């Protein structure tokens, strides 16, 4: 029996009309959605554009050159034995490239959400008025009004506007670009000499090459999330809690996606099955989505005018079939259909893909077959929301339901099950390879240091666009934490000058800490924090869920920040939900404050609380 | 040979603005193109060097350009890119004018005997008898031949990562002011997110110029007249960002639930580079338009007084609104609108919508040959002396309106916060594009005996006063010698400087109310400057007006261009610095040199 949600849905009027077929040479025919995966010309053009964006921001020549510098920095961290990140090994270098790019995009998205919270909290009175006065308008229209009363940097919710507002660092990672020119299948036969091991360390196995050719990261902008967050929000606190709840789920999926590459298994590929010789009025489509950043998959079937879907777990497969247990059913889907198979990479999460599938199922009678095909493929392949305003709102309402506490899917249960299954796979693959080949060969190809995106020791390069009296400001957001333990932070600063005086500022709820290091080309430890099982830390006597680090350098060239956990495979923290975020509230308004290194005296350095300063002039104490 | 009709649907023009994926796809390749040639990481790096060069020009107090302030740096990034792209197009126009003058006899024969053929065919024939570098008039060919500088400026990518909200409360400390200068107000952020520059290639302009031309002199005059109007509008576009107001955004209104047989479309164009706007309405097979002024608007209405009417347009229609950025000027958009009105009966409704939207969004000319001819004929009429629109009156009124807004906004902010905060957020130095002290980084692809040649074109000037030109040269080797050549009609002047990493003044010129200068006893409308440097890395040229807000020269029209003719044939010749001797430097007329050797005097 298909799952039936009693969600209220707006009526949908199709462009095709009562006869459910568009007329030739009409304005509606020109604005109709059309398939992108099925059409070869579009599926080729979009891959080329996706590759171009990756090479613009991340150049292989630059990343190959920075390997020597990055290896030295990781060595200088002085990690314990068994926790060292050796970038001289090819597999470790390849995994670091994937990890560093994925973390930078996740960090930037988290940074923008933090600023968006600050603008909402500053304008709480106006925001509260909008939410309660305007409850009948569409979710997209509510987002436009909310982004206007607050002085948001990105005030556009349209797809074209979001693309323009997005900058380098949030571009999805194109997997095939990373794994280009890397040697595969180096063969040393029964040799344990140092020369043979050196050659062995320079190559990767075929499995990692296959994993990278099927990888494409998904990072959701805050402007995308504000529409689901404001569908039923009544107060500003509820809206902020919804925004934080969604990004908590999103971040947890990103860590799982990186964990898939670390294990020795190959990741499945999303594909579409179409008839070999399509016949008019007898066509059918089958869509199989294996999201890399997720714990659940989707199978959608379009036979006639009927839409049927199934949600299957990506863990526990016996290798006899590519589908796990079914968690939510929406009809009967036949995955044994015979036809041409087309491979694609999804640009939306499982929660986003399912929301449109539920909305489309309710609109099957009111929408033509072509509209269902066009709207689904555009969103899966290009993250393009449907132009039908009523259908778009229905998708956002379902998106809120799948994330709320009353979701039909228990996301926490499935995410935890996926972590346990992935850990077992790594042990099985390592043990199997430890028998067939040596322990040394097993360590090269399956490193134990790389576990998940927010556990492995990773670096994040900082970009600087703000200059205060000659000092460039580099910003890094410490936290939030999905793992508990002891975490160390280090900063690497490269400057053209021979001798340089650079400063670091750590901002909390009440006061900030200012440090001076004056050491170049070597990591310098700035902060050591202890995170409890609830993900909060005690920074100068108060509980903090996140902090802000600002680095000031004169004539800077590159500033890197290293994040390090004391023990490998740090225990995880249960993912926060809406109730958890509402219960405890932290003020982030102080992250906007800045200091001027040039006008700094010796007494101003150290830990100082806000009451010691005047309004403004946070550099100099009274 | 009767078709089954499937082919004709494939060549049918498409609704790029209305269809979202088409609008998503175009934003992406326009962003990619801007980031390919202008890198944010590179621009942030050269901020320190540019700040030093601007400070080293020794400008008078009240005219200094301080790039340490975030607002001035952002406006410089927009100004330098806009001025650069306009400079290449003017250089290309001067080169084209030269080629026409060498082949006047052959060009005259084409213009007299090719009245029957299409405008595109005539342009292709004209560009073949001349040895033009670019010989393609198609849109696809023009994209291939386009260089790096002429790429349009993408506003949203420029204003990315810049801090907006900085709050110092009742604090006059030096530390607080330094933090305040590092940020920009929210108003400037909205200005950049709605900014896209349009630069028209000389190859696109030759089709309107040659459509009714009968002589080579008329063809040259038509080309110069169009670029006089085009350059004037680019200045207005930059001044719009300088004032404290927010520029409007072009948008299209479509029905919320469109019907198959009763659909309508309304287009509102707000060209940033222009003084007039266009509203086009498509109800059924009827097309109506209205040209409205972008100045004098009250708070209640976003439309000013309408100056040209083509029917009745209802701007209060209810429906979904889709924002877009135009790639054609108001004159270019108006030319197609008049052409589309005439051919409304002979064209399908899908053709009317597709042809209009492709031109505004992608600068694509219609595939129809009859439609193409009428548009280019209307383009010539709108830029001629008998134009229905008095462009000079509307351009001058926009200048007056923008100046009043700057004073009103600056005074309003001065009362609220103070003089210091007002100067940070509303700089008074920038003013117009050609007024502003700006730099133009130069690319050199020609090497003569180890010396790379960098070419700069002085003028034409839309403003009069005293102007200074300075050159900065950065080289890898220490103790180099670089030469500067300024070419005129009578001769050239050779200078040796041998100083690097600092600005060095090479020319001081005086321009009168007619936009002409006296260079060694002769009247010059423009001059060509060539800088020769060995093992060069970067060559930058600065221009500076002695006083702030220089008065404007009246925009030249067709009759003004044919009245006085200046020879630019000498701008092609160059020298070999390796073979220079001491007696060769200075001002030397051609009569002294031998034919073909302009390096060594007889």
């Amino acid at each position: 029996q298909a799952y039936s949600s009693g969600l209220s849905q707006n009526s949908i009027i199709s462009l095709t009309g009562n006869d459910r077929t568009v007329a030739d040479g009409t304005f509606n025919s020109m604005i109709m959605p059309r398939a992108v995966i099925a059409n070869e010309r579009e599926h080729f053009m979009k891959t080329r554009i996706d590759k171009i964006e990756h090479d613009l921001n991340r150049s292989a020549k630059q990343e190959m050159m920075d390997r020597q510098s990055l290896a030295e920095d990781y060595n200088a961290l002085n990690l314990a034995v068994g926790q060292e990140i050796k970038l001289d090994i090819a597999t470790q270098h390849q995994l670091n490239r994937l990890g560093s790019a994925m973390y930078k995009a996740d960090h930037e998205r988290e940074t923008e959400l933090t600023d968006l919270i600050n603008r909402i909290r500053e304008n709480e009175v106006t925001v509260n008025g909008i939410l309660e006065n305007q409850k009948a308008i569409t979710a997209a229209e509510r987002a436009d009004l909310l982004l206007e009363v607050v002085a948001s940097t990105a005030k556009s919710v349209s797809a074209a506007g979001r693309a323009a507002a997005d900058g380098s660092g949030v571009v999805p990672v194109f997997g095939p670009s990373v794994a280009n020119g890397i040697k595969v299948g180096i063969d040393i036969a029964d040799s344990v000499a140092e020369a043979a091991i050196a050659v062995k360390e320079s190559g990767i196995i075929t499995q990692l090459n296959d994993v990278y050719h099927a990888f494409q990261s998904v990072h959701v902008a805050p402007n995308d999330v504000i529409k689901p967050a404001a569908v039923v929000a009544g107060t500003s606190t509820e809206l902020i809690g919804n925004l934080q709840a969604i990004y908590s789920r999103l971040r947890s999926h990103s860590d799982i996606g990186f964990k898939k590459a670390t294990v020795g298994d190959v990741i499945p590929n999303s594909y579409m099955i179409k008839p070999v010789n399509s016949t008019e009025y007898a066509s059918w489509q089958l869509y199989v989505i294996h999201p890399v950043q997720g714990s659940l998959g989707l199978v959608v079937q379009l036979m006639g005018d009927a839409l049927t879907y199934n949600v299957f777990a990506q863990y526990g497969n016996t290798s006899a079939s590519e589908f796990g247990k079914t968690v939510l059913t929406g009809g009967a889907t036949n995955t044994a259909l015979e036809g041409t198979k087309v491979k694609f990479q999804t640009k939306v999460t499982a929660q986003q893909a399912l929301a449109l599938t539920m909305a489309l199922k309710d609109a099957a009678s009111m929408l033509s077959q072509g509209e269902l095909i066009g709207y689904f493929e555009q969103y899966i392949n290009l993250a393009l929301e449907p132009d039908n305003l009523s259908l778009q709102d229905n998708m956002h309402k379902y998106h809120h339901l799948l994330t709320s506490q009353n979701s039909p899917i228990d996301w926490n249960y499935h995410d935890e099950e996926m972590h346990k299954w992935l850990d077992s796979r790594k042990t099985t693959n390592y043990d199997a390879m430890q028998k067939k080949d040596g322990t040394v060969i097993a360590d090269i190809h399956i490193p134990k240091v790389f576990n998940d995106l927010r556990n492995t020791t990773l670096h994040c390069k900082l970009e600087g666009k703000q200059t205060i009296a000659g000092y460039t400001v580099y910003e890094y957001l410490i936290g939030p934490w999905a793992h508990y333990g002891d975490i160390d932070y280090s900063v690497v600063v490269d400057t053209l000058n021979e001798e340089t005086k650079w400063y670091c500022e750590v901002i909390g709820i009440d006061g900030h800490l200012l440090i001076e290091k004056s050491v170049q080309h070597k990591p310098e430890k700035i902060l050591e924090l202890t995170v409890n099982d609830s993900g909060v830390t005690s920074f100068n006597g108060r509980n903090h869920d996140r902090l802000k680090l600002k680095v000031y350098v004169k004539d800077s060239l590159s500033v890197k920040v290293f994040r390090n956990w004391i023990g490998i495979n740090a225990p995880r923290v249960k993912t926060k939900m809406f109730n958890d975020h509402i219960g405890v509230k932290y003020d982030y308004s102080h992250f906007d404050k800045n200091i001027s290194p040039a006008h700094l005296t010796l007494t101003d350095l150290g830990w100082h609380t806000w009451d010691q300063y005047n309004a403004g002039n946070w550099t100099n104490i009274k | 040979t009767v078709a089954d009709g499937t082919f004709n649907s494939m060549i049918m023009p498409r609704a790029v603005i209305a269809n979202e994926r088409e609008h998503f796809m175009k934003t992406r390749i326009d962003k990619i193109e801007h980031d390919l040639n202008r890198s944010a990481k590179q621009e942030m790096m050269d901020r320190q060097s540019l700040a030093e060069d601007y400070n080293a020009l020794n400008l008078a107090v009240g005219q200094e350009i301080k790039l340490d302030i975030a607002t001035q740096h952002q406006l410089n990034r927009l100004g330098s890119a806009m001025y650069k792209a306009d400079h290449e197009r003017e250089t290309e126009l001067t080169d084209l004018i030269n080629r026409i003058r060498e082949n006047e006899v052959t060009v005259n024969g084409i213009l007299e005997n090719q009245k029957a053929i299409t405008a595109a065919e005539r342009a292709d024939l004209l560009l073949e008898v001349v040895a033009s570098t670019a010989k393609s008039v198609s849109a696809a060919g023009r994209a291939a031949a386009d260089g790096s500088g002429v790429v349009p400026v993408f506003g949203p990518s420029v204003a990315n990562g810049i801090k907006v909200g900085i709050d110092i409360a009742d604090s006059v400390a030096e530390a607080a002011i330094a933090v305040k200068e590092s940020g920009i107000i929210t108003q400037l952020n909205d200005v950049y997110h709605a900014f896209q520059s349009v630069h028209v290639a000389p190859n696109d302009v030759i089709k309107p110029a040659a459509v009714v031309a009968g002589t080579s002199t008329e063809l040259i005059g038509n080309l110069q007249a169009i670029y006089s109007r085009l350059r004037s509008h680019s200045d207005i576009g930059f001044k719009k960002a300088t004032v404290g107001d927010v520029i409007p955004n072009s948008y299209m209104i479509k029905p919320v639930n469109s019907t198959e047989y009763a659909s309508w479309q309304l287009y509102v164009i707000h060209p940033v580079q222009g003084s007039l706007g266009l509203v086009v309405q498509l109800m059924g097979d009827a097309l109506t338009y209205n040209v409205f002024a972008q100045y004098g608007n009250t708070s209640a209405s976003e439309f000013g007084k309408t100056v040209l009417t083509g029917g009745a347009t209802n701007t209060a229609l209810e429906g979904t609104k889709v924002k877009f950025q135009t790639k054609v000027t108001a004159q270019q958009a108006l030319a197609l609108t008049m052409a589309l009105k005439d051919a409304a009966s002979m064209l399908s409704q899908g053709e009317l919508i597709g042809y209009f939207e492709q031109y505004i969004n992608l600068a694509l000319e219609p595939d129809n040959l009859s439609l193409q001819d009428n548009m280019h004929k209307y383009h010539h009429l709108l830029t001629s002396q008998n134009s229905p629109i008095d462009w000079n009156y509307h351009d001058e009124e926009m200048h007056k309106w923008l100046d009043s807004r700057k004073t009103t906004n600056y005074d309003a902010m001065q009362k609220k916060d103070g003089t210091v905060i007002a100067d940070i957020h509303i700089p008074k130095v920038f003013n117009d594009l050609r007024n502003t002290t700006l730099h133009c980084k130069l690319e050199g692809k020609q090497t003569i005996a180890g010396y790379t040649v960098y070419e700069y074109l002085i003028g034409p000037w839309a403003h009069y006063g005293d102007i200074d030109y300075s050159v900065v040269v950065d080289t890898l080797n220490e103790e180099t010698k670089w030469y500067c050549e300024v070419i005129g009609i009578d001769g050239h002047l050779l200078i040796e400087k041998s100083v690097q990493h600092k600005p060095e003044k090479i020319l001081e010129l005086t321009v009168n109310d007619s936009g002409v200068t006296s260079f060694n006893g002769r009247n010059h409308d423009r001059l060509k400057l060539k800088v020769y440097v060995k093992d060069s890395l970067s060559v930058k040229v600065f221009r500076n007006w002695i006083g702030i807000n220089a008065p404007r020269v009246k925009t030249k029209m067709f009759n003004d261009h044919i009245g006085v003719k200046y020879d630019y044939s000498h701008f092609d010749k160059n020298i070999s610095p390796a073979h220079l001797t001491l007696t060769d430097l200075g001002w030397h007329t051609w009569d002294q040199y031998n034919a073909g050797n302009w390096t060594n005097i007889k």
């Binding site: 053209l496 000058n497 021979e498 004539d555 | 790096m45 050269d46 320190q48 060097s49 950065d474 220490e478």
Partner: peptide, 14 residues
Amino acid sequence: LSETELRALKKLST
């Protein structure tokens, strides 16, 4: 190579 980088590098050499 940028102008600032070239200017800074020449200072170190001298």
